[PDB]
Amino acid sequence: ARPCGLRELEVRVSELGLGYASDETVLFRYCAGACEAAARVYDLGLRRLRQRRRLRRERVRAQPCCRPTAYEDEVSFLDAHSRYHTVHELSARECACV
Amino acid sequence: ARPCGLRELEVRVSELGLGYASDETVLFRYCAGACEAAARVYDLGLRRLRQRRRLRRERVRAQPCCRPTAYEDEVSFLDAHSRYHTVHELSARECACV
Amino acid sequence: LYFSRDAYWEKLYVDQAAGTPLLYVHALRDAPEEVPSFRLGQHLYGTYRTRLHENNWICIQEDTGLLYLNRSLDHSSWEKLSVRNHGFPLLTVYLKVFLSCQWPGCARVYFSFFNTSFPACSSLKPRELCFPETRPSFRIRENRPPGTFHQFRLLPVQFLCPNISVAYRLLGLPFRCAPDSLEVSTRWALDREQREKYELVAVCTVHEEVVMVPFPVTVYDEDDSAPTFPAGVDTASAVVEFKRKEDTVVATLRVFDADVVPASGELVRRYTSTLLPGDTWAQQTFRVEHWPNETSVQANGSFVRATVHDYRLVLNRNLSISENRTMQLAVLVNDSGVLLLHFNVSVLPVSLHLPSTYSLSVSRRARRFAQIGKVCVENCQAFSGINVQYKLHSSGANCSTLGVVTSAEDTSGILFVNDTKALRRPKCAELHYMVVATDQQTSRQAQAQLLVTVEGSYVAEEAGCPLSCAVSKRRLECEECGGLGSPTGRCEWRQGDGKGITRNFSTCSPSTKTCPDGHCDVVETQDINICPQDCLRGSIVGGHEPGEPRGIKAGYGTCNCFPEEEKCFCEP
Amino acid sequence: LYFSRDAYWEKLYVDQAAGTPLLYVHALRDAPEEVPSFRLGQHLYGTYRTRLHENNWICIQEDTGLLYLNRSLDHSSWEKLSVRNHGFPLLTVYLKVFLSCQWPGCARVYFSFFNTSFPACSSLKPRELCFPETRPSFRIRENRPPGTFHQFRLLPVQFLCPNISVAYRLLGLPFRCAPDSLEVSTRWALDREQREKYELVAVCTVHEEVVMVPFPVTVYDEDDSAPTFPAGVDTASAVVEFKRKEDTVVATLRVFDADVVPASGELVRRYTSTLLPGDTWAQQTFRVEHWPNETSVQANGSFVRATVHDYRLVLNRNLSISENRTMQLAVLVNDSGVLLLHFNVSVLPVSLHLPSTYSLSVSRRARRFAQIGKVCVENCQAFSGINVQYKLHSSGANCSTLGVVTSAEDTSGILFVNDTKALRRPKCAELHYMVVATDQQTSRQAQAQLLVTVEGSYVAEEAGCPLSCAVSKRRLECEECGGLGSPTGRCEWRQGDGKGITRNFSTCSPSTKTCPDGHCDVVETQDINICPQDCLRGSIVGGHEPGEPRGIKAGYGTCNCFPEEEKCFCEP
Amino acid sequence: PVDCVRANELCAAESNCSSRYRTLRQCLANKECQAALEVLQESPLYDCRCKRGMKKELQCLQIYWSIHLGEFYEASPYEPVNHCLDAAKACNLNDNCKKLRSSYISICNREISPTERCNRRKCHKALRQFFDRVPSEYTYRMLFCSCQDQACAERRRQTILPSCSYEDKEKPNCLDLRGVCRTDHLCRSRLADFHANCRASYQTVTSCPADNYQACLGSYAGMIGFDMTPNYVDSSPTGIVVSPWCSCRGSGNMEEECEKFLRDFTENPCLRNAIQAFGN
Amino acid sequence: PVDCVRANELCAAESNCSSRYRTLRQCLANKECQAALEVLQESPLYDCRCKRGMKKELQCLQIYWSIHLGEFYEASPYEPVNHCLDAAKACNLNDNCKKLRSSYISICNREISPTERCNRRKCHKALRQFFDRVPSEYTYRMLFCSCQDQACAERRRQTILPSCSYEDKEKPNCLDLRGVCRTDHLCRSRLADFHANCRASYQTVTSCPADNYQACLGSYAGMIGFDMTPNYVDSSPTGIVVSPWCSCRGSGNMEEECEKFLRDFTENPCLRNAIQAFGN
Ligand SMILES: *[C@@H]1O[C@H](CO)[C@@H](O)[C@H](O)[C@H]1NC(C)=O
Ligand SMILES: *[C@@H]1O[C@H](CO)[C@@H](O)[C@H](O)[C@H]1NC(C)=O
Ligand SMILES: *[C@@H]1O[C@H](CO)[C@@H](O)[C@H](O)[C@H]1NC(C)=O
Ligand SMILES: *[C@@H]1O[C@H](CO)[C@@H](O)[C@H](O)[C@H]1NC(C)=O
Ligand SMILES: *[C@@H]1O[C@H](CO)[C@@H](O)[C@H](O)[C@H]1NC(C)=O
Ligand SMILES: *[C@@H]1O[C@H](CO)[C@@H](O)[C@H](O)[C@H]1NC(C)=O
Ligand SMILES: *[C@@H]1O[C@H](CO)[C@@H](O)[C@H](O)[C@H]1NC(C)=O
Ligand SMILES: *[C@@H]1O[C@H](CO)[C@@H](O)[C@H](O)[C@H]1NC(C)=O
Ligand SMILES: *[C@@H]1O[C@H](CO)[C@@H](O)[C@H](O)[C@H]1NC(C)=O
Ligand SMILES: *[C@@H]1O[C@H](CO)[C@@H](O)[C@H](O)[C@H]1NC(C)=O
Ligand SMILES: [Ca+2]
Ligand SMILES: [Ca+2]
Ligand SMILES: [Ca+2]
Ligand SMILES: [Ca+2]
Ligand SMILES: [Ca+2]
Ligand SMILES: [Ca+2]
Ligand SMILES: [Ca+2]
Ligand SMILES: [Ca+2]
């Protein structure tokens, strides 16, 4: 396994499935990996309380999912109809196991 | 559905399954709920890139799981052998949809 | 007196002997009493207005206007000059020539220096034997006594290669090339208003090559045209009835002028528009705005250009409704020959009466902020600068249910349900209101009757419904539940299409004629739960295009909105 | 002269007449020339040392020592006093009584005032007719001429109820109650060293009730005992050979004293221990430490208490090894009767030679920081205050593989593999070292031979293995892979039990005799990848109990550790 | 009543009273001292008190003990004011008592060396912080909770964590321990406060001054965190015996005074009646 | 060569040169001005230059134009220095060009009212920030990229976003637009820099001064972001025609000067050869 962090990719804008009909290429930084050495006592306690069905049958999270902390500001591009478009917060800058 | 936030519970220490043989009661504040109105453009983009199998077959997270931001400091108690125990960061103080 | 050109050209070399003529100059005159003197400047200027050394080599003949060489040259005298050029390569020097530095009072003469010596007579192509590299362009003022403005012979070429037979030739034209002397003169005086440009071809014949060179002459203008009406129209009549805004174009008329000379810098100072006095109401409510524009007119199969001055009469303040006047205004036009203009103006008052009876209904299942009908003074969409607010006056004073806001776009009032408790009571089932149409500047008003019957059954609301229609996402969860702005108690689902990011996006709205419209009127901007997809100040997640003041202008697929967080989602 | 008690007691009332006797006082004497005078204090003190008013009511007879009433009382004179009490309720006043304020030179006499009047003779229970509420406690110094110290009759009771027949009685005792006069005297002089406490019972007979009251007498001491040996022992011999630390108890002897009077405040000033001079090496290396302790000894079937002074002789600095001396020391003991003490001391030097040959081996599959054997000067675990470091000297000077750190717990050196590259070479297969045992204070040293043979095959390592043994979690992933501190190339899995949070927790360690031991020695503290579960400075997630300097002292289930993040997990 | 800090401020508003106060302070720490005393008897500094858990308590107690003229009892400078498992539950379910409880437990249970059991001064400071600024329906319910077996009495004895703050290597003399406590400023004031609300008297039917159990429990709980720290001697259910960590051995000819000092803890009827009545 | 800011600092180190400089500055903004000029001709302030994208450029240009003695051409005060889709890809894959590109696009594409298309001044400021502090292998590759059809030429025309910064409601006169630009300090300096590296000459084989294509492209790219902003007139693939947003109408008797000004953009052989050679 590999620790969670930034990974990069180069994609067309039309491959993102947002509906923009463009052909430019954007850089896409996501967070990926698996957290193993970030569990705490809260995690073990909440997991053991789920195992006894003590909870009120809701959606709780007893494994730390790896999400970004901050995001990039703006990505601008042009399309097939000569019309600029600005997308706010498309890719990540900081990956943390929160 | 109900938005994600703090929920409270009152549990015996021996019910936490940590191994402590005590009978005192502690207050347990966890985070619970479901996030619906917190998805961003990054989430839709990474989900659509998973749907085309463009990724390198790793563990990625395309739904925001609801985890605590900060935790409480210390919970101390006494057991059946007259021996105090201090547990660091057992319950949450701030729930956020990160 | 004025020079026929502005910039003269000549090539220099190394070790050119004294007494070698460089060029002629030409100064066309204005009156039959003038002899063109020619004085040189006392500085051999260099690059970018830089003095190098006092003129000590090139002398002048004032009578024929001849620039020639008094002294010789060597490499030391040009390395003396190229040091003083302040970091620039010595490529072209120039002199100033006065005549009694800008055109027409002065003309600067360039000189390109070559490091090589004078080339052989057989080493020169005929293109460099006939005409210089910079082709001339001549300037003749119209209505002036004609003279001589050009000469063909390259003087150092025939001075240093005198054995080559070189001839020059031109093609009802007013110009002529003199026989046995290669000066070029003009026969009769010119006018721009008949023709402004003369392109000719100078033909050089060597021994043997025939070379053609373009030859431009541009005729310059004086102010020889008084202004003229287009066709007899001296008056313009207009009626000020409905608009009354701060700046509205009331009347407009053209003035034709063949004169061009007062150009855009000095056109303000010369073409003078004076509104003649007599009444302070005109000068406090009207002003005379003026601007020119150039057009092209034909004279003899060509295209000359002339000016067309538009004079218009513009309001200065919001006129009141109580004005019942008519006047005639006089405008003076001065072409510094004088012109007079007339304007008939008629400011008519406005009656603001209403229909006698407004009969309309409302469902009992309706909610707060639901639009029912419009109150409007009869000439609805013709008011521009008039504030007209509407109110309500309940006669029973017990059953306050409806309310009126004044949409100033059409200047009309909107009837909306304000209180849900009084609408559900079986006692307040036939409501009688007295709608009052007011005015802000003057206290004139009108009034009308509003009978409204509250009709229907009543069905209780589900506890699993949200407070807005836009929170629902699909069709079945939209049409089976109600929101806030609905006029009948249920929400309406409009369906778009699959054409990508378009203005026709499928959504759940209270009213499909009011909510996904693109305008956030006075009802929807009260509390933001009614229609967030026309009024929000937030962010849209997905492929979108934002509203121009606010809202969602275009979205991809279905668009739902959470107004409690100021967020929308557009997604298929 | 000294008062038999310190605090006297008496009850007051309202409107008590003049000439009413309150109480007697008693002052036991010291010499047969003394007559006890009795002067009163000039202030009626109140609560918490607060002056109220000058004494103007209670007078005294100096001869018999009689406190009696000179003037009368009323409510005005006591409301005069209760104002001046500074916010306190008037409950008890007191006077001071001098005799020629603390015991024995002074005694304060309390007076409890009642707001009511004097109660009737039939309204009084006999318990309040015989003895006061605060029972007395008497103080008699030993070896003093005996006299009268107590009297029974409550003087206002028999002054105001004289018709009640009240008798008093006591049960080889030195005390006696006189016939026909209720004074209490002592027959012969006392000594504490035979008996210290006398509990008696005073018996009061009214008309009719018989009441018994405890009657304590405590005999006080003087310094009437010179110090004494326990049984004849005046010398103490001890040998300083192996310890040599800064403060070690060399010799110790008791001194018995029946005297108690120089108590713990003034025992430093009186029981004086002086180390007699003669040699500066003794006074710079030894000191005489002294402390008492009280024991209980029997005299005639009772238990008296006496002091036992322990005198011990303590080192003052780290002695060097090169000392070969012997001495006798003299200590003077002063009981301010004088005592002399002797100490035979013998400081013997230490030889620090080594065995001639150290023969040991090592596997070829081993890794860096793997413990092999110990070098140790022969008397290993007996050195206390001596620094002995060990080094290596390779004879070939090409094949540096091993290293030595000095564990100062046993003062022994540990052989550990330092370089893995030189160990895998087939050229450096028989290593010859010269181990040198040094010393810090003196440059004395020793040396020995170290032959070590590098034996085994070699198997390459898996790329899927981590750098530590503790990263593995189960048994199969522990025993099928190697770590850093292993001596054979593979890790060792130790299994605990299911007894909750215990010291026996199952883990994966390099060496099961060194890593999960509870001590972080000099090898393991070099680089923290070797044994994190004995050496970490971090946090343990799960039910645990932390190590006392550092480490994991107890854990629940299996405990693995990530030392790159300073974290451990204890979990079943 | 005006406390001694505001009394010092009102003394600072004049020149004569401040001059006599600084004069007596320079004399203490004939005809000058008696003049300064007869001026300062009418001062607001005379008969000023302090309070419990107030702002800047140590400065008020330094103002008080600098004009005391010097003795077994002293005047108190203050304003004249399974059950134990359930008490621990009621403290853990709070948010202030939980934080301060975990503070003093995590400080007092930190073993440093094999010779030093704990850090003594920070343990006493954390105990003072817990028994100053927690409301007294939580600190008394844990400390005075009636028991009927051994486990309850052991949980009740283990409350102030006696293995760190109460015990020591040796038992000193009670008079020397009293001298150590009377050298300090806070310990002397809390001891004088205990010697004002828990004395024994034969007048009242409850053996307490003015029949105030609350003042006796408040004076007892104010000593935990000092050198004269009381606790329970054993895990006996019914016998409620408190004492400091001292004994009467090595006293000399002051055995009677030392036993009379120790009987105010061991055999005090007012304090035992107060603890048993809070148990009811 | 020492720039004018350091020249002002070295002028501030003396009294006579600073006094003559302040004298000529008070005279401009007979016998006094000529004396100040004949002193300041030997000053380091004489023949000082500025640089492109330097620290405090506007102060250097204020030092320069305050000693200019006043004209069609002026001396430059500077140091004498699908392909378009791939250029956009190479700018998006960077991290500086991406941020500044998204900055000027998100500013210049913000419609305010139905009458005002965009905020003009912040659009021009964002264009200046993009074409100052991005390396010139990114700003030139997007702006001068040879095309063979209509979509490439339209993407190339849409690069500086002409609907906000280039166009207007009306086409002014080129002489009045030149007067507006010469009123400013930065626009006048960038115009004089364009009139030094992109003039036409008959001497060189490439029609450029000293055969320097790089100086002509750098002088052209320094005008984007001002009132005299050039762009392409149409989406023609081969015909590379640049001009400002002006025309020769309404000129008067200055038609020849206005057309001679406009031919330095429309029919400049040096600039067309430079753009076509960068295309090669
Ligand atoms: C001037 O006339 C031309 C004719 O086409 C027109 O395009 C232009 O907008 C006019 N300008 C003004 C200011 O009226
Ligand atoms: C305006 O004035 C004329 C003048 O007689 C009058 O006939 C007309 O009724 C007036 N307009 C109104 C609205 O009264
Ligand atoms: C037109 O303007 C000129 C210059 O101001 C003035 O002399 C002349 O009188 C004006 N014409 C009229 C009719 O006022
Ligand atoms: C004139 O009328 C317009 C249109 O309603 C209004 O916006 C403006 O404020 C008015 N101005 C004055 C000075 O009344
Ligand atoms: C609607 O009702 C509210 C509640 O009294 C009132 O404040 C508001 O002015 C009303 N709106 C109108 C347009 O009358
Ligand atoms: C004194 O002797 C007693 C006897 O049991 C012992 O408990 C105590 O520890 C001794 N104290 C010292 C200081 O030796
Ligand atoms: C110490 O001194 C004695 C005195 O003769 C000697 O016999 C003995 O060998 C000495 N010790 C050593 C280790 O040399
Ligand atoms: C014992 O101490 C006393 C007091 O200092 C002194 O007078 C006496 O001489 C001492 N005894 C001896 C033997 O020195
Ligand atoms: C004395 O020896 C001990 C034991 O090694 C050591 O810790 C201490 O530092 C030494 N002191 C001196 C002064 O050498
Ligand atoms: C182990 O080898 C390293 C590498 O040269 C060296 O720095 C270190 O001192 C060695 N350790 C010992 C105990 O010799
Ligand atoms: Ca004419
Ligand atoms: Ca004209
Ligand atoms: Ca004309
Ligand atoms: Ca709308
Ligand atoms: Ca005796
Ligand atoms: Ca003695
Ligand atoms: Ca004795
Ligand atoms: Ca170890």
Residue numbers in the entry:
A (entry chain A), B (entry chain B): 100 to 197
C (entry chain E), D (entry chain F): 29 to 128, 137 to 207, 211 to 246, 251 to 379, 387 to 622
E (entry chain D), F (entry chain C): 37 to 65, 75 to 115, 121 to 131, 159 to 357
Relevant lines from the article:
Signaling through RET plays essential regulatory roles in the development of the nervous system and kidney. Glia cell line-derived growth factor (GDNF), Neurturin (NRTN), Artemin (ARTN) and Persephin are four ligands that induce dimerization of RET through assembling 2:2:2 ternary complexes with RET and the co-receptors GDNF receptor-α family proteins (GFRα1–4). Here, we report the cryo-EM structures of four extracellular 2:2:2 ligand/co-receptor/RET complexes, including GDF15/GFRAL/RET, GDNF/GFRα1/RET, NRTN/GFRα2/RET and ARTN/GFRα3/RET, at near-atomic resolution. The structures show that the extracellular region of RET adopts a ‘C-clamp’ shape, which is stabilized by extensive inter-domain interactions as well as binding of calcium ion at multiple sites.
